[model samples]
Target: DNINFANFNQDFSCVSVGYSNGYKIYNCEPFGQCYSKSDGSIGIVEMLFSSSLLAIVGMGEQHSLSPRRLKIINTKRQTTICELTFPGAILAVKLNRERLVVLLEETIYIYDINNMRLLHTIETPSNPNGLIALSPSSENNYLAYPSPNGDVIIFDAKTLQPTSVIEAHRTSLAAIALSKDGLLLATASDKGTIIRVFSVATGIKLYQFRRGTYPTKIYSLAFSPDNRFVIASSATETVHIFRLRHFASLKVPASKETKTVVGVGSKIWDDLIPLVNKKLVHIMVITSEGFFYKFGLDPERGGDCVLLHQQSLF
Candidate 1:
């Protein structure tokens, strides 16, 4: 009953989990509890890369674990950097090297990462579960959230502006992910069966990946650092791994937006293994069920992703 939430750090190098007693951060390769504290039921345990800094939020009763408050903790500094309170219970939080974004049920607050100053507050359609994706790339930082109308609202985090509104699906989006460079986006709707990749610059449909015929609730969507693969983890035990290609320049013609390379994924909680140095890469998934899955991705001919390992969180 203690487990409440889990997520990977921005780099996928570490995983953070929230529980009623406290929180724990684990190092991926070493696969051990690296840092943790038994502070109480924390709803959100979000990390800024492998850095000691974390954004922590409480769960349930307002006094102890206030959903309306967010604490920026610097583990190294051994002090709280700043604390932010909202008008309503905070549903979600996302941050990068340069910006911090908090999601309230009906409002979205964007902040300057270093100074912790509120830059803008956006009125969003009702977001019950806090569906949002923030690009890790600082140069082309983009923020995505589902529109009440089932559209994808893309925001330029760098400029503090709404960049694009893409009607990605007939139903509301369950999850969305921006590639490492922010040139591509992977999205899944409430339908849960079909997943799509799009051109971030043009909003052109690039690929349609069918997960299955049956409907399910998808929890995670992620991109490889090289933009070669997309992974989706859902309500069921099955995970869908998809391969796609984005070029130096986009060529959207009568040929339709794009195509898909079928690769069986072996993995999430989902994220790409760092591929900047090596040709072969792995995908990681950490589920609320308290399991860690690592799957190798196909680089050349897309096929089944092998299940590398499965480990329990505790």
Candidate 2:
């Protein structure tokens, strides 16, 4: 009953939970509880690429973990590396090896990961949910969050500047995700029936997938490691995986002013292993229900899934 939030680590290889009493880290790929502690209640726990450094904020059950404070710790030494206090309660925080991002209700702060120097502060529209995403890739550390109306703001954390704005939806965005290299962006509006993927550099609409006919809340959207598929985890039990590998014929955006890829071809999007001959693919959805859902999806047969694993995570 004390668990406050559960989120996949930067790599999606592990899931971490923050609680009113402590925090726990679990390796989802192999199914193991990796770490747990109970010194204070934690509201947020973001791991830096499986490194020893973990960024944490708290629900304020203990003054040590105040909602307005952010702590970066070296778990091995059990010592605090850096601490930052914000003007308001931090709604969300994310970091790569090079940058740390803090999200407030109406503003976002970006800092250089090494020195913790303030790089940029962006004034955003009402982001009550603190809906923001940073690319896990240190090479292209782009930041994404919703803007006023239905637009998506794509900010370059590396450059500390705004790069592009995507008119992704006509309604409020429910969920937004960036690819590992920040090359692609997936967005779902409050309608939630339709999810769209756009090339981050060009703001070109690439694909649209139908999730359902009725409206529901989309909690998270993620791209598969190979960039072959996208998964939307919603309020319902069914996790939808949309296929992208099958669309092999892609014309690279030819805009030089924006520095969009000029002649990279489809290899820009495809993984090294372009094994598209087999039309079927499998993915697992790990839920807080303690169920590991293994689902099979294909371009044609499409979404015939099987619930495979169960554990007493709670």
Question: Where does the lowest 10-residue lDDT sum fall in candidate 1?
Answer: 245-254
What is the C-alpha lDDT profile of model 1 across 156-189, one tens digit per residue?
9899888888888888888888887877888888
Local accuracy of candidate 2 as per-residue lDDT tens digits, 1-314: 42566676766666677776777787764567888877687888888867778889988646688888999988889899999999899999898889999999998999999999999999988899778889988887889999976799999999888999999999999888888787899999987888899998898999998887878777667786677777776665446667772221121112211111000011121112344444334354544433334333444455344333444345
The lDDT for every candidate, in the order shown, is: 0.74, 0.72
What is candidate 2's local distance difference test score? 0.72
Could you tell me every candidate's TM-score relative to the true structure? 0.85, 0.84
> Of the candidates shown, which would achieve the greatest lDDT relative to the real structure?
1
Cand. 1 Cα-lDDT: 0.74
When summed lDDT is taken over every stretch of 10 residues in candidate 2, the lowest stretch is: 258-267
Q: All predictions: root-mean-square deviation over Cα?
A: 8.0, 9.2
